[model samples]
Target: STGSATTTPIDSLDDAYITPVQIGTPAQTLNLDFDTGSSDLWVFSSETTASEVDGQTIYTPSKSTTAKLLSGATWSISYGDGSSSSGDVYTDTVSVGGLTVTGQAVESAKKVSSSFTEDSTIDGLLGLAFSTLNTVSPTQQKTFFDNAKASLDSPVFTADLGYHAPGTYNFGFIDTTAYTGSITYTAVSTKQGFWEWTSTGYAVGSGTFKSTSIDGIADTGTTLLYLPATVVSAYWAQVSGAKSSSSVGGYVFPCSATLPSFTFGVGSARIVIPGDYIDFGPISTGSSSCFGGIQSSAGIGINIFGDVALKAAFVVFNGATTPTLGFASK
Candidate 1:
């Protein structure tokens, strides 16, 4: 069996992508952030405090006939942005697109951070990273992909994230037509519970391609691309009016600045990110300065190829016993 789902950017800046997921036997649908950087399927639920509940949808497990409480089971997770959620656990029927999994662990939020409550666009997060990173204590639960892999025609899922339009997430099979050129397969090091891979090298605009192994994670949950300080500075130097503003908190440049394109290698294949995509948007309501999509990852500990880079290519999260990642242009 196979399944497919549609994902759209939450806002114009492409801050995050959301996909509709059906939970419980009655099928309560909620727009969830399919995060590849974390491992935990958590949602706001009846257990959540009323004050913490903003305009987002909540999952009601009591209403589902198949919902079963996982006694003594609990989960808690935090993201780089400092947003966090913790809750009790429940096993219920869950579906994404057309793929269904019985007894899927649905972490019901008892408490959520202000960041989550403030954003009404996202209901919760469904982690696509390795289950080893699952926060459930005692006995860890498998991710949606892990459970569904057994029934799927192929143990793989693909992400085609669009810039300002709706993209696709296909499970069990790769859509050949969704991408251009042949796929460049690379080994993934899941030792860190992330879709971690190494890029052969990179180049700024039409400059000389620098041969350096840049290790980073392909994270859909994150909004921007983060690289080493040296590489980031190199890219920003090409822009005439770019600067690291202490007020804006990162690199920002004139909105009208002619930005240069960024290219990174996957094995021998090269994927180029358009200059326009790096402009991001205005720093303020109508400010002339704009934030950069690529920033220094010095504080982040590891580099990240977030949506800014992911949107420029078709990504495959292959779930073989020895996992691998595939990249292609579209």
Candidate 2:
């Protein structure tokens, strides 16, 4: 088998592309947010308090013929966005598209934080980060991708994100038809369980490229672009009436502000994000100010090239001994 699958956007580009997956023999399908930011395949399930779960699909181990509890095993995880879920563990036959991974670890939620409880659309999260980051206690569990990698034609996947449009997530293979031009590759440092890399530098609009390396993570789950304060400040400075807003929690500018494009370096590939994408809508309801899609990742220690930056390119996430990330214009 090719051991590959395709995913589609859940809501909008403002959200993420979610992979539909089935767990157990009889099969229970769930639309999962395929997150490259964390490692833990968890779902809202029968174990979850009825009050915690809303109108969303859930995993029901008792209904699955091939489900088995991993004795003494449990998992708990939280996200940088403050969302969280925790639960007991079960091994089941998990399948995505035509690929199947028997005895795959599936965390069944027993408790969920408000961030998750209110999300109602996604049934769970399919963690694509390294297994080293799995949160299962006593014994950690591998992700479905890791367990299924050996059978894959190539240990790789591609993230094809679009702006307010549908996109695909190709597993175990890359689709040439989805992108244009050549993909420029860059080395990935995964010591931190993320697709961590150092950019050569970047430019504000059509300005000269500053030769300063910036460390960041390529996270599909995150919605905005996050860089060092210096970089963010430089970009905002070019726009009139832009300022770091405490009330808005990020840089905001007047709705009429003429914003400029932001260019990021992915190796020799210079990916550019249009200024229209940076104006992240009105800061609030009827406010005349608009929030920016790119901000400072200061407290987090590392910059993050989130969906705002990633949706601007065709991203290839390689799962090799020396993993690398490839980028090209979509």
Candidate 3:
């Protein structure tokens, strides 16, 4: 069986993508961030402290007849951005885009940091990365995609993100019409528990291509594109007023300045990210300087080809015995 779901960006900056997910027996819908960077399907719940609960929806496990407590099971995880959450575990019926999975482990949050409490639009996160990264103690749980893969028509899923519009997440079969031209398949290293791959090279605007191989993860959970410091510096040098701003945490430039497009190679095919997409919104509400979507990965340990790059083309996460990633221009 195949299933499809719609995902939308939460704000004007396209800071994050959210998808509606159903949990429990009667079905309580919550807007979840489908993060391929981590492996834990956790949510805000009745167990969450009152101080940490803002306007976000909370899942009430007691209200679901099928909800079962996973005895003594607990989970805790932290993200690259320093945000963290910890919770108890429960097994319940979870469904995404009509693809239902029974006894799916649903982590119910007992504690959440200020970052999550402040972001009311995101109720939780549905991890799509490999289950080896699951944080649940005693027995690590499988992700929604991992649990449903065996029953899917194909052991794969695709991510199609947009700059400021609604995108899609398709499970099971790939929609041929969703992309133009053939896909360039590449070997993926699950050793890091991520859909990590290497790009052939990159080109700034229409300049000459750099034939250097760059390793990175296709992380939808991350908002910006983080590459090697040299590559990031090279791209920023072309802008007339661009400068690295420690106060702003990244490179910023005049909002009115003409920005150059970014192109990264997948095999021999080049996927281009329009300049407009790179001009992230203003640094401050009334500020004329805007942040650049491409930033240095020096502090991040691993380079990240986040949403800024993923939104530019079609991406596939093949879950066969040996995992692989496929990219195509659309």
Candidate 4:
């Protein structure tokens, strides 16, 4: 618990940050998604239908002498974006960085959706959220962080998700050298099983700041920034080639166009997403165009500050007491 681990970006897609982890007795290695949105450390496994797994590396617990089945236990989860996976459970020794947890619940996927099947890079998901959010039935399971927290020096973790580059994740410690300026702290309420919080207001580019109360979550699993419908519409109104029903969807703009800066208020702390970070990537609907990373939450029901917004700041997930989320310039 006094130790830590750092993560580098996915070399191929660089869409999500992945780190190597060891599972089982012989220490079968796996690269997993460090998702804070949900709980359940599920993996593409030897039990998976061979056809459903395109190029994913499968984790075979049977090969690990320390792996033991959690008789009659299973897990199934569907993302809000239509992605899903379901599998049986196994209790095994799991290690990340230098921290090790004995008897950690590892879900082995037997069935997975096409969304997960196409991705060959990530072998599974390592949930960091509260154990209550776990999809496993019969009994809820704790996350790696939760199981290891009590032993951590400070019961904290840091997410340094850099833009267009690799970053580090520090557990049981804060690397002050990685960030500038003092961290701004905000009370976190996880009644919903997520690192949820409220933002005081926001500004589009250098425009006037609107003190609109916004409820949102800091989610590494999500790729883009999502805000209230009103906020999304207001910002797009000033952009070029804007449309709500465009083929590429959300908000599209001419390639190379300078997207506006997004500033979200965390009390007195203002975290700004540079104008350049707004272009998520080049996407083609009719004619090839650039898609803005900022989107409307719409039916998702809650705003999400995904990688696009989170990358602009160094985030600290504090679990010592009331759960305060600290943010600072990276």
Index of the highest-lDDT prediction? 3
Model 1, runs deviating above 4 Å? none
Answer with 1 or 2, whichever has the higher TM-score: 1
Per-residue lDDT of candidate 1, residues 1-330 (tens digit):
888999999999889999999999789999999999988999999999999998999999999999999999999888998899999999999999999999999999999999999999999999999999999987799999999999999999999999889999999999999999999999999999999999998899999899899999999999999999999999999999899988888999998888999999999999999998787889989999999999999989999999999999999999999999999999
C-alpha lDDT of all candidate models, in order: 0.94, 0.86, 0.95, 0.85
Which scores better on lDDT, 2 or 4?
2
Q: List the residue pairs that clash in candidate 3.
A: none
lDDT of 4 by residue, 146-193 (tens): 988998888998888877777877789888898899899988888999
Clashing pairs in 1: none
Task: Report the CA-based lDDT of candidate 3 relative to the real structure.
Answer: 0.95
| Per-model TM-score on C-alpha atoms | 0.99, 0.95, 0.99, 0.95
Give per-residue lDDT, candidate 4, residue 163.
73
**Cα deviation of 195, candidate 1, in Å:** 0.8
List candidate 3 segments past 4 Å from native: none
Model 1 TM-score is: 0.99
lDDT of 2 by residue, 252-271 (tens): 89988878999998777788
